[PDB]
Amino acid sequence: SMHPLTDASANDALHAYDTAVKLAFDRIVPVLKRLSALQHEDDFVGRAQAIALEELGFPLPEPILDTAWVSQLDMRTLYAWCVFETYEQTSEAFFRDDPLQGQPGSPSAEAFDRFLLDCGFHLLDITPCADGRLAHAIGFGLRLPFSSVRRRPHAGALFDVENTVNRWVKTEHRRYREAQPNPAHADTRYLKVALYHFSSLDPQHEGCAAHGSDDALAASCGLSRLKDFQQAVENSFCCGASVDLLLMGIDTDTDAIRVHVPGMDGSTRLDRWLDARDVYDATLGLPPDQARQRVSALVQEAAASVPDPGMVTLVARLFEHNISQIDYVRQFHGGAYDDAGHAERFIGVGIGFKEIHLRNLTYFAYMDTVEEGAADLDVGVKIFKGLNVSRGLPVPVVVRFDYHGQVPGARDRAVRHCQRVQTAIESRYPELFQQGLLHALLTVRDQDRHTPAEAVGSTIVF
Amino acid sequence: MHPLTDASANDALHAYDTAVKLAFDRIVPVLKRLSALQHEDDFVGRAQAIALEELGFPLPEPILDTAWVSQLDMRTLYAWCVFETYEQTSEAFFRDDPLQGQPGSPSAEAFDRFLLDCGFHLLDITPCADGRLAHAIGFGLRLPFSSVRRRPHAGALFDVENTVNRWVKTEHRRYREAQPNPAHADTRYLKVALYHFSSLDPQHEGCAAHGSDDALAASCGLSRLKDFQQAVENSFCCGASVDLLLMGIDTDTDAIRVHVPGMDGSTRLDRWLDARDVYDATLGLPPDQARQRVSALVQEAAASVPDPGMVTLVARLFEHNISQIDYVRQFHGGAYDDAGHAERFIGVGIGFKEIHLRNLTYFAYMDTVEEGAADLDVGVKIFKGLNVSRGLPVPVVVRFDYHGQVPGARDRAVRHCQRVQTAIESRYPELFQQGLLHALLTVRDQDRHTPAEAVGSTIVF
């Protein structure tokens, strides 16, 4: 890679990972086209199974192939099935092989938690925008181990203030009772980050659709939620409780971040920021340790007003990491992603997917209640009415809910919550359903341990 | 062949009718060939090449490129092919003038002069909208299309009040431009009502707007004619009148019959002069005499002493219709086998300037669906038997004329078309959702002689 701070080996491993997962999804349609052409031939059911097993790595539903002759092979359902099975194998390998090398207990996960405490933060809770183009922001954009971070995605970065406050009490409680992540009377803070995005190449149409592609607006709402969380904590607990804040954006064309370096008490400005492109150039010609020393100087000078020193160290580390992602896009994507808009393979709805860390793989819509999250799901369906329905393909929806395995009943409740979402989806797009253009897979994840999600129902039935 | 038949004209018109009808009827056979090929590797390539050869255009690629999922969407291709065929048909009408009767054509200039000599400064014709009469002007009466206002209506029930308004507009143009002639000149506006009947099966193949009763269709057509005249005479001072002509046509043979009127439009409903008796009466005569005998026959069939120019003009229509009688004997055995409805698409809105062939278009006049949905429902039921019976969609072409001098009239017309489309999609949601009904939106600038313009479609990509 060109920049002396860039992790060339990591760019290689990351690039192979992205390429392999995308290829698995992209070979579905060529395989299914080939199958469609065989549906009148002699041993089609047998032939199809062996073809699918050999080129997709999993079989197809026997009763679909069996019943093709009545009307025709139901490719819409087969497409959904294959997307679902590919999601499922992808997901499995994530938990089993740790492609990002960031699982709990991994060297880089423990290391980042240690560095974080060294900067005076005992938990990094980041809300990116739920835009599928930001799904790699943690693992690729900031090169952080995914298990060292609380990732809480929302459309336009509008996280839930009340639930954040509660995550803070939980965190405080484990500090008091288990000294995890650290002792309770250590001088560390909860750090809440909001991460907006924008398009340098098409600043006006390809930005954050939840804020009308107005960069200034997405940054303002993002900061406004940060400030509310901070105020909520101070007003809700005795003895000067507080949190730290960080506002950031990322360019969906180049993956370069920009940061509004705050001053000690959270003071940040919306019109001033440090851009990673600018940092990258100021250091491109230096030895690593001198480049690193310049990043700190730049972050320090860029502070809205006198900043907290740990904040400088952490923020400097994020720029150092993003530099690798900047070279990544330059070295693998001509300096600008050809898929500037939405190109996602399936819609994910419910709780953020622990295991999705790839750009443009999943259009995510958060929803804890259906009658509360329909809007974002609607934006996602209309996106896919273009990506998929226009090609004759259905809209593959993957429902997710985490649960605490160590709580009796929790798994069954989450499974029953998956089903009310499915029931709600079926009511809401009744036409798309009827026609075979919308399908749902239900999944649940024991968040109490590092284990694969598990499928617990589907709109595909035999 | 009759001594008065224009042989070569009969060939040219036949060559035209068979050409356009071939274009439309080649569609199904092509789509049948494509359907057989949709599992082959090079399907898209082979289909495009078949369509170019056969229909002369290629197909929407999205529909071919995705046939492997749903299967090949024939209903939508068929509609799209009918629309594309209509566009090529229509564009070539204005480009090539197959009838040799556009504005400024020698034929049109000749006939405009002849109408003036007969004492008439405008010829306004309402045939029943029935698809079996769309060729009445160009084939049946051999008139240049542009020398004539054609105003079709179900059962020939034209708008009395709007016709008076057309008379007013005509006089005004005589006053201000002396076009077609000075206002003081002793000419009259001529309104014609053309009803039809079936000589082979009079009980069921007649004018369905009037229950296939010949008398009712004849008498309602006259009722409108009288009412128009009475309306002019009552609404303006001084002279203020119009001339009238009630005619029918047999849809089995294309013979006309004229109720020759007295000078003041005195028309008898029970007595007519049938072109078949004219035909037989003059068949053994050399042309010069045959023309004389047609004259004396029209003179003698008048209800009371006729106007001299009316006698001349009606004699010319008989002389002209005798060729069309020979036409149907030559190329249709003396009786069309498509005795009934065999139209290739529904047309709604204003009459189609460019449509002049028998059983090509089921036309439903309407300003809005809210009115004349009855007339549209009739067509839709018919195309359930013609197209939905065999799995094909019902193709609708909406047309509105607008004055391409009024600023924004084109815009107004386009929005009028979409207003109709919404109303149609609401009237037949079952067919529309099952993809068994599609609409093409066309507007035509009626201030000059250019082709209509396609402005939207239910087929969407």
Ligand SMILES: O=C(COP(=O)(O)O)[C@H](O)[C@H](O)COP(=O)(O)O
């Ligand atoms: O970070 C999140 C939230 O969203 P995402 O899955 O996108 O990261 C997970 O809940 C982690 O497992 C937290 O760890 P724990 O549940 O043990 O506190």
Ligand SMILES: O=C(COP(=O)(O)O)[C@H](O)[C@H](O)COP(=O)(O)O
């Ligand atoms: O009656 C007609 C033609 O009847 P049809 O359209 O049914 O053949 C009109 O005189 C003109 O054509 C209208 O406008 P324009 O002068 O532009 O043609």
Ligand SMILES: [Zn+2]
């Ligand atoms: Zn087949």
Ligand SMILES: [Zn+2]
């Ligand atoms: Zn966004």
Ligand SMILES: [Zn+2]
């Ligand atoms: Zn009729």
